[PDB]
Amino acid sequence: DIVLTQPPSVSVAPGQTARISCSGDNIGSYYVHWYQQKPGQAPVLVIYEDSERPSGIPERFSGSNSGNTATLTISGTQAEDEADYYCSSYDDPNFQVFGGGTKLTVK
Amino acid sequence: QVQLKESGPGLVRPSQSLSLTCSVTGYSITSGYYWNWIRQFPGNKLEWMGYISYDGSNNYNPSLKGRISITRDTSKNQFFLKLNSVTTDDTATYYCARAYIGFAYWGQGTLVTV
Amino acid sequence: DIQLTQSTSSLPASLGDRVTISCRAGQDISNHLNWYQQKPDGTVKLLIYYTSRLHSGVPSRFSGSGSGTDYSLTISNLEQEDIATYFCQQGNTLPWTFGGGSKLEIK
Amino acid sequence: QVQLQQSGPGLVKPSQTLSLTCAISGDSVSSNSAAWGWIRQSPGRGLEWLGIIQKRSKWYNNYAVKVKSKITINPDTSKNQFSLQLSSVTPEDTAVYYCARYSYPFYSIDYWGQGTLVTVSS
Amino acid sequence: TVSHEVADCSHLKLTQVPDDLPTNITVLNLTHNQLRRLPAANFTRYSQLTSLDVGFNTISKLEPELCQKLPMLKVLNLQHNELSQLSDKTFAFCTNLTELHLMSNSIQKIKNNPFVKQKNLITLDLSHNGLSSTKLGTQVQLENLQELLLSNNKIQALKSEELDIFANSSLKKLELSSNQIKEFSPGCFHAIGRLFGLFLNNVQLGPSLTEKLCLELANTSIRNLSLSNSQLSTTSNTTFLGLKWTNLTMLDLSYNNLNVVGNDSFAWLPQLEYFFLEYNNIQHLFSHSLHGLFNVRYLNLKRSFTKQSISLASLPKIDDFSFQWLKCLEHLNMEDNDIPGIKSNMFTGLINLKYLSLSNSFTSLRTLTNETFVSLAHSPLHILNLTKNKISKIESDAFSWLGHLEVLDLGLNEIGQELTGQEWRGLENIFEIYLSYNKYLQLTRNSFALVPSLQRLMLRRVALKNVDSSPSPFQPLRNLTILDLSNNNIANINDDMLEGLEKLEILDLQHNNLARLWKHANPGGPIYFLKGLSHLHILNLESNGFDEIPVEVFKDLFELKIIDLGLNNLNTLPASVFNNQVSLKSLNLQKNLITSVEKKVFGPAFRNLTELDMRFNPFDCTCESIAWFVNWINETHTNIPELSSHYLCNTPPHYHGFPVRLF
Ligand SMILES: CC(=O)N[C@@H]1[C@@H](O)[C@H](O)[C@@H](CO)O[C@H]1O
Ligand SMILES: CC(=O)N[C@@H]1[C@@H](O)[C@H](O)[C@@H](CO)O[C@H]1O
Ligand SMILES: CC(=O)N[C@@H]1[C@@H](O)[C@H](O)[C@@H](CO)O[C@H]1O
Ligand SMILES: CC(=O)N[C@@H]1[C@@H](O)[C@H](O)[C@@H](CO)O[C@H]1O
Ligand SMILES: CC(=O)N[C@@H]1[C@@H](O)[C@H](O)[C@@H](CO)O[C@H]1O
Ligand SMILES: CC(=O)N[C@@H]1[C@@H](O)[C@H](O)[C@@H](CO)O[C@H]1O
Ligand SMILES: CC(=O)N[C@@H]1[C@@H](O)[C@H](O)[C@@H](CO)O[C@H]1O
Ligand SMILES: CC(=O)N[C@@H]1[C@@H](O)[C@H](O)[C@@H](CO)O[C@H]1O
Ligand SMILES: CC(=O)N[C@@H]1[C@@H](O)[C@H](O)[C@@H](CO)O[C@H]1O
Ligand SMILES: CC(=O)N[C@@H]1[C@@H](O)[C@H](O)[C@@H](CO)O[C@H]1O
Ligand SMILES: CC(=O)N[C@@H]1[C@@H](O)[C@H](O)[C@@H](CO)O[C@H]1O
Ligand SMILES: CC(=O)N[C@@H]1[C@@H](O)[C@H](O)[C@@H](CO)O[C@H]1O
Ligand SMILES: CC(=O)N[C@@H]1[C@@H](O)[C@H](O)[C@@H](CO)O[C@H]1O
Ligand SMILES: CC(=O)N[C@@H]1[C@@H](O)[C@H](O)[C@@H](CO)O[C@H]1O
Ligand SMILES: CC(=O)N[C@@H]1[C@@H](O)[C@H](O)[C@@H](CO)O[C@H]1O
């Protein structure tokens, strides 16, 4: 199977760079997506097929996928970027697999 | 110096039943007080499950109706937990504790994952 | 079934200072409140019972007050050990319910 | 632009049936390039997957195990909306429900529903 | 290690991708090596690759970047490797691919969507893998795919839930052979956007299961259906019923032990054009067995019928008119059978038949008569093959019905008779007659007077007799161009045998005894039987015992390109005997008693020669005898095969193994 697992929390000083990791046995063999969920809001796709963003998501957001870890990177952190972040992929029975979510905090 | 220690399964498959045993040393479970079962949800929330008095006549928590069992074995000085239909929200660190005015002596804790 | 909200003073404290952990209930619990010190090590102790009464061996920095729906726990001055989490709990009415807890952190 | 709009009873009694509706605009339900499904989130942060529908020659629906016996998702082309239903709901089913557009190739969810809180309490 | 715009590094014990090769290569063969992974870095310099064949290695998985490094890669061949786990990233960046070869990799199952990215792919081959299902994706992909190859797998059902991922694809080839299918669940073939060709060979199916498949094939664009070695014991009017609602134009039912063909079995195929029924055990071809096949223009019945067991009429049986419905049949092959004989209406109704091959089709056709081929009178037959049928006598007007026949092969038969020339009556447009390899053929002057249009006449090994008539039996054949009279021990040829045959181009006279007719001491003079043969290009006179050549036998053959007189006793030849051979390009005196290649003889011949062969000769290593030849050898461009090993000097005693080219 496949079990995405990401850190519980991470904080970032505004203006600095945030990275949120998503580990998993051979996650490099999968395409990963990233969903941003602010308090009391549906999530928002920010990175899909693990590398490049959708239309309207800012360039500050970027992701990679290598080996057994996949990371969402947020340069130039703003106050609005404070949210929960989930990584995802799909394996055949379950068409969406989610990580634990990481709660990103900003001063 | 009257402490108590839990023990039992660390893993239980869902929609099944959980059981735990708490031994008590130093003081017979039939002399006095009340003998409780307190759990701690993952987010550090706490919840008393029920007790078993010195005499046997016990009381259970409303939020666990018809699916919670607290018995005892005075011959070897312990009391047991039995949780029916163990779903996923029943994963917690399970403490055993003794109380007259409040829970005065707790157990070292044991984690149960479901 | 009975309401226990916890609220403290200044969030990170300086060592050797007064800290108050307040506790607000739903209805008059006739001063049947208790206070528990759980170090992240997992160990749980009773510190205060029936509002103000302290257990034995509990140092006299610890003192609880309040009468009715509002309570509190106070440390006359903080110390390294006193660095842990505290849950207010009542007994007046079944079922015996707890409060959210409060993490006591320094530095 | 495409956007998903939920609607339905947010209070449902135990042993009863939860029934919600995702109404699409800016995109067809019978369209290609995407599938439709539901994602549930219990208030303790758990953001979990429910099931999807999708069409190739006919409509297929792959549900998550754990609701594989209660859930029913199916489309309604005449109204351009799809539905969620759960039978014999327990208080465990109290959560926030999102309808979702997974898009091909690899089932990324470009667009979500507003979320509808459903509570299973007597 | 080899290159001409194409880097061949095959079979080099390589454990490492060569960094030696030039960076402008477009094909890279790395097959049959010990490679275990293809790290994308090692392919950075080879960016011009359009074909990458790396079959027969120990490769376990592909990193995605490998594809990114070759952005022109159109053909990837990973066959016969250990590549058994496919992820969504194994081919994700190999977009310009049109052929993906994944045969023999112990691929047991396919997970999600390995191929969803290959939008240009035309051919996908997943044969010889343990695939238990045709599931290749969870969505509709591969709309450009034309060839899906899944043969030789453990696939046992065809379900629309798995093939409908091709609902936008037009499959010219769907190869599902050597798979053990047991069910064709409904809709499975309409799942595919268009299905043109289906291949189910070596698929153990059976008559009732086969019936279902055709019902499932109903209303599909199917055009080619191949059920070879399907264990089709019998057929019925019900079997190919669903094929009624198709435009199927090709059907293979060969190698099926097909025992009984019920009537109207193929009534449902009015658009069929190619029928392959070879290699069956059909017992009895009833009247209506082939009813309905009125558009078929090619049938093949080679070894189609049962073989004579112990002869108690264990022979096959073809009722008359059995072919009357094939109106468009242009080409019929029935060779290698045990049909007892041609009945009076066997071939009736074949109004378009041009080619009919009947080689060894019969137990024996002992006698061809004016009744035999009567059923062909209304066909435009151009080619008729009657070889290997033990034919023994041909009688007058036997082929009179075959008016427009142009080629007739009666070779390899037991024909022993006198050719009166009545036989060929009716053959008005005949061009070739093959009579080689028969028992005995006795000629008259009219043996071919009824066929002047004849251009090829083959008389190899018939113990020919009476070729030495006053006007030769061949005199009426004034447009003969190829004549084969070999292996007849012909001892007497008359001067004027080939007179009139001004157009004769090939003349084979090898293995005869016409040796004395060119000795000087012949009673009356040597026989110049080659005179007037201007257009002769090939002349073969091997193994005739010749040991003299008259000075002017070849005096008229100016277009002679190949002269062939070896395995004779020629030692010395008259000077200027080859003078007029100006177009001569191949001279052959391979096994003879020649000792002296003098310039006065071989000069004009050697002038311009494409190839020379006079091996195994008792060459004399003396200047008077061999010298000028040795110079010409070292000089000339005409190639001399086996020169250094089979041109050996025999005299004088001191030069015996010396290859003639060394002195
Ligand atoms: C399997 C293989 O080819 N390995 C070699 C590796 O040993 C070498 O260090 C590297 C440097 O280019 O090139 C790789 O191709
Ligand atoms: C197609 C092409 O450019 N081929 C060249 C060739 O002309 C040249 O002679 C050789 C170096 O000797 O290098 C090859 O790459
Ligand atoms: C879009 C793209 O990359 N197309 C490539 C092209 O760059 C290359 O010149 C050609 C030759 O192989 O192959 C095409 O498939
Ligand atoms: C500039 C140039 O050489 N162009 C050619 C042309 O045939 C096409 O643009 C493409 C082929 O795919 O690349 C080259 O072969
Ligand atoms: C037995 C059966 O199913 N027959 C139907 C036929 O009535 C229909 O005309 C055709 C296409 O519409 O498809 C066939 O399969
Ligand atoms: C309903 C119908 O017409 N069925 C015919 C039957 O009449 C005929 O006798 C048989 C072959 O003998 O072939 C069936 O297709
Ligand atoms: C069974 C089948 O394919 N029928 C088609 C028919 O629907 C179409 O109108 C016609 C025009 O060419 O061609 C036929 O072959
Ligand atoms: C349009 C079509 O089907 N073409 C081929 C044809 O080239 C070949 O001669 C025939 C054999 O009968 O096989 C068909 O698959
Ligand atoms: C015209 C014709 O063919 N008639 C015969 C019929 O008399 C005979 O009873 C039957 C044997 O099954 O076979 C038929 O072929
Ligand atoms: C042995 C036998 O019964 N053969 C019959 C034949 O008599 C009949 O004429 C023909 C249909 O024309 O069908 C065959 O199966
Ligand atoms: C059956 C038979 O005799 N065949 C021979 C064989 O040399 C060759 O395979 C064939 C070409 O089809 O031509 C014939 O001379
Ligand atoms: C038998 C018949 O009805 N017609 C003729 C017959 O008169 C003639 O004798 C025979 C050749 O000998 O050729 C047959 O076609
Ligand atoms: C002239 C001609 O076609 N000769 C062929 C011969 O090559 C072949 O060996 C034999 C069996 O296939 O059939 C004959 O028809
Ligand atoms: C009764 C009979 O058979 N008459 C035929 C006759 O029609 C034919 O003209 C003649 C010449 O071959 O052969 C005879 O056998
Ligand atoms: C009787 C006969 O068939 N004569 C033809 C003649 O019509 C043709 O002009 C020539 C070649 O051009 O070949 C001859 O054999």
Numbering used by the authors:
A (entry chain C), C (entry chain Y): 1 to 107
B (entry chain X): 1 to 114
D (entry chain D): 1 to 122
E (entry chain A): 29 to 691
What do the authors say?
They are constructed by connecting heavy-chain variable fragments (VH) and light-chain variable fragments (VL) with short “GGGGS” peptide linkers.
To generate bispecific diabodies, two non-identical VH-VL chains split by thrombin form a heterodimeric complex. We determined the structures of three monospecific and three bispecific diabodies by substituting the arginine at position 83 with other amino acids. The bispecific diabodies were produced in single chain format by inserting a 42 amino acid linker between the two VH-VL chains. The second Fv domains of all the diabodies are clustered in a small area, demonstrating that substitution of the positively charged arginine greatly reduces the structural diversity of diabodies.
